[PDB]
RNA sequence: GGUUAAGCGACUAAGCGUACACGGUGGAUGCCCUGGCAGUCAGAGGCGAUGAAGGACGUGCUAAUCUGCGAUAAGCGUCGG
RNA sequence: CCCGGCGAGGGGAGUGAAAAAGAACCUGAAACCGUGUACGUACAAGCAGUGGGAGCACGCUUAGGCGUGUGACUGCGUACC
RNA sequence: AGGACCGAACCGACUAAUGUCGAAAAAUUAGCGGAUGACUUGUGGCUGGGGGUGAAAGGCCAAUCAAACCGGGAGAUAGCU
RNA sequence: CGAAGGUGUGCUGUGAGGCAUGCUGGAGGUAUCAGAAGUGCGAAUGCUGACAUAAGUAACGAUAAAGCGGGUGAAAAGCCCGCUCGCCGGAAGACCAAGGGUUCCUGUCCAACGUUAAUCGGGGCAGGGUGAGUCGACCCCUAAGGCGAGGCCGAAAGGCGU
RNA sequence: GACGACGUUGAUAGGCCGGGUGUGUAAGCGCAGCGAUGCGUUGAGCUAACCGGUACUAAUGAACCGUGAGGCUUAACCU
């Protein structure tokens, strides 16, 4: 539970070698509405494969 | 022509804003707005509210061009601390320091 | 737990009050040192 | 170790779990759409689809059966009285799940459950 | 010029190291004074029942606190500058 | 004036000798923290330096080669009080 | 009638758990001992450091007690780090 | 037409150091030779201020419990309403004394506080509200008990007491 | 985190019809009983994850990283 001899800022870096946020670059474009949602999701205006699905 | 926008004293820590403002290093703006609109975090609330304020400083003060407009440098740097006192058990306290951070967004056409 | 300061103003007044501490000569020196050490609140007042 | 089990626990005791899925399924058919998280959306489906299954072949006894499982006759009033000819032909599924997005409250995978036949 | 094999063989860098350029936090150094200590020189060497030292509560154009003052309350009269 | 939540914060403009003097305000070191460029680095172990040293990268002279950065690999080497 | 029995309140702390950088500088869940007495609680007083008080443990005297705490002797003294 | 200080740089001395100079800096510095000391720091589990590390780990404070729709709004698991669900009920209900002293309420705001966000709050800004011949005290009467005119007693204070 | 099965050229999941399984004579009517209840309907009814099928819903066109015949020298075979 304790540290006896403080690790350098070197090894503090290499522990942070894998924290990097996964990119969500894979956007989609609508079939018959042309707008952009996230893939397998709905827009801000209720479109999903060219349908007013939620009408909100 | 070059322009810079800064949010000073953003109420978080440096590694919390370093992680999403690592992806938008070396990007164009419209792919950066689209990688920050759908990153599910709090720093993506922070700097995406400021990264759009940087392009405002282009279209208004510097180069109105936004289509082919790059982001050159972005580096979140530390700020002050709100050193409150946290109570730990058995009578002893604990000097908490609520962290605070500064972010620059630098926008130009290299 | 039953912590030590279970307070009052009736215990407090007749012990550490003005006329209590400015009764005897050994009390009076405290009122004549809190003066000279320049304290605002002399002993207890509301 | 879960190997070939089913019915996710959703981090509540069984008594709490069953009583929520009542008052979501009561809430589901009254407003016809709900926003929930992804698993509750994914597992309100496995609970509600019995109801409109056991309400096409209308009987006297199945009224209490959708009252022993519901204890809400106003929801039972919408069943058997509109839902009958609404679902004669759908041999099977009645829910088109929609993946909406992300809860700005606490980063949940939000979603949308509906009955299929929608015109309002 | 092409072909099989044999030997040898960089640029890759998730991060990390070092030097420079860049700030970031930080508030040390130099500089500054109506702050304070030690004394020289005279003067005083007391205030107090024709109500003290030290306080409470009020007073203005005012919300507050400090200074002053006290139902005549940031002030009255009086003789001067 | 633009952007923002008619927030915070910030970029221009104007004052001013200067806003890398802006109310957290003269000067602003070090620890610590990042940005960029250059080099080394994923078969090598060990007080992390020193002696030697290829290549690469640069300021240059004067084109013969020094200076600075890094430093593969190698010889020794078990911190201070 | 009972310093009588059973058992809540109230009280006390027996056993185990958990906790023991605690939710707490002595607790929480499961039980346990009593429960009209030599009991329990509230409020207002009295006693005082070689002194109080004690169904006596050197226990208690503001989480500290084989002599409390504050200031003053006093910058004690230290052949000792 | 640039003092100290800071920050690099080329030179220089056997070392402690010195001298010249680029940038930053914006008003003070001090030769030669001598005089006096709060005169040179790595340690003392030294003091003080600041910043690392463990670590983005642990934990979020009782294992009474949520779920949905609507609205306000820039953004809503937590705020306001409605609809059910679940928990307390010799209490986790409602009044009072103690003790706290605006903590109650409307408008408004989210920097900070609330172990999170927050339009909400016992948070900040502003205003408002507490109305008694009978309720409690003050007031008339004593207990335990404290002072204590004369007095007794004691180096002095002061102790006991009518 | 990996490995595996599918993504409308679809049985990968949920639903659904049936079967299987488990519990036992559902409810509601009528009869017998002043009544509790017993009988008939009725080995009915209800049935988690099990097995066999059915696309009813959910598993989209893309977008994306990954490229553009693969260095030096010698030998042995192509001419």
From Swiss-Prot, chain A:
Record-level GO BP terms: cytoplasmic translation; response to radiation; response to reactive oxygen species; ribosomal large subunit assembly
Name of the protein described by the UniProt record: Large ribosomal subunit protein bL32
Gene Ontology molecular function, alphabetical: structural constituent of ribosome
Gene: rpmF
Annotated InterPro entries: Ribosomal_bL32, Ribosomal_bL32_bact, Ribosomal_zn-bd
Database matches in SUPFAM superfamilies: Zn-binding ribosomal proteins (SSF57829)
Disordered as annotated region, ranges: 1-37
Keyword Repeat: no
Family: Belongs to the bacterial ribosomal protein bL32 family.
Name of a matching Pfam family: Ribosomal_L32p
Keywords from the named record: Ribonucleoprotein, Ribosomal protein
Subunit structure: Part of the 50S ribosomal subunit. Contacts L17.
HAMAP family reported for this sequence: Ribosomal_bL32
Disulfide-bonded cysteines: none
NCBIfam families according to UniProt: rpmF_bact (TIGR01031)
GO CC annotation: cytoplasm; cytosol; cytosolic large ribosomal subunit
UniProtKB/Swiss-Prot annotation, chain B:
UniProt KW Methyltransferase keyword: no
CDD domains named among the record's database cross-references: Ribosomal_L22
GO cellular component: cytoplasm; cytosol; cytosolic large ribosomal subunit; large ribosomal subunit
GO BP: assembly of large subunit precursor of preribosome; cytoplasmic translation; cytosolic ribosome assembly; response to antibiotic; ribosome assembly; translation
Keyword annotations from UniProtKB, A to Z: Antibiotic resistance, Ribonucleoprotein, Ribosomal protein, RNA-binding, rRNA-binding
Record-listed L-tryptophan binding positions: 90
GO molecular function: large ribosomal subunit rRNA binding; structural constituent of ribosome
Transmembrane segments: none
Additional comment: The wild-type allele (erythromycin sensitive) is dominant over the resistant allele, and is also dominant over the temperature-sensitive allele at both low and high temperatures.
Quaternary structure annotation from Swiss-Prot or TrEMBL: Part of the 50S ribosomal subunit. In TnaC-stalled ribosomes forms part of the binding pocket for L-Trp with the leader peptide and uL4.
Function as written in the Swiss-Prot or TrEMBL entry: This protein binds specifically to 23S rRNA; its binding is stimulated by other ribosomal proteins, e.g. uL4, bL17, and bL20. It is important during the early stages of 50S assembly. It makes multiple contacts with different domains of the 23S rRNA in the assembled 50S subunit and ribosome.
UniProt similarity note: Belongs to the universal ribosomal protein uL22 family.
Name of the protein in its database record: Large ribosomal subunit protein uL22
Species: Escherichia coli (strain K12)
From Swiss-Prot, chain C:
An annotated GO cellular component: cytosolic large ribosomal subunit
Pfam families: Ribosomal_L34
Swiss-Prot/TrEMBL keywords: Ribonucleoprotein, Ribosomal protein
Recorded GO MF terms: structural constituent of ribosome
UniProt key word Ribosomal protein: yes
Superkingdom of this protein's organism: Bacteria
UniProt-listed InterPro entries: Ribosomal_bL34 (IPR000271), Ribosomal_bL34_CS (IPR020939)
GO biological process: cytoplasmic translation
Subunit structure: Part of the 50S ribosomal subunit.
Similarity comment: Belongs to the bacterial ribosomal protein bL34 family.
Protein name: Large ribosomal subunit protein bL34
Gene: rpmH
Swiss-Prot record, chain D:
S-adenosyl-L-methionine is among the record's keywords: no
A single BP term in Gene Ontology: ribosomal large subunit assembly
Function: Requires L15 for assembly into the 50S subunit.
Alphabetical UniProt keywords: Ribonucleoprotein, Ribosomal protein
Domain of life per record: Bacteria
Organism lineage: Bacteria, Pseudomonadati, Pseudomonadota, Gammaproteobacteria, Enterobacterales
PROSITE patterns, sorted: RIBOSOMAL_L17 (PS01167)
Recorded GO MF terms: structural constituent of ribosome
Gene giving rise to this polypeptide: rplQ
Oligomer status and interactors: Part of the 50S ribosomal subunit. Contacts protein L32.
Record-level GO cellular component terms: cytoplasm; cytosol; cytosolic large ribosomal subunit
Gene3D superfamilies: Ribosomal protein L17
Name of this chain's protein: Large ribosomal subunit protein bL17
InterPro entries: Ribosomal_bL17, Ribosomal_bL17_CS, Ribosomal_bL17_sf
One Pfam family here: Ribosomal_L17
NCBIfam families with a match to the protein in the record: L17
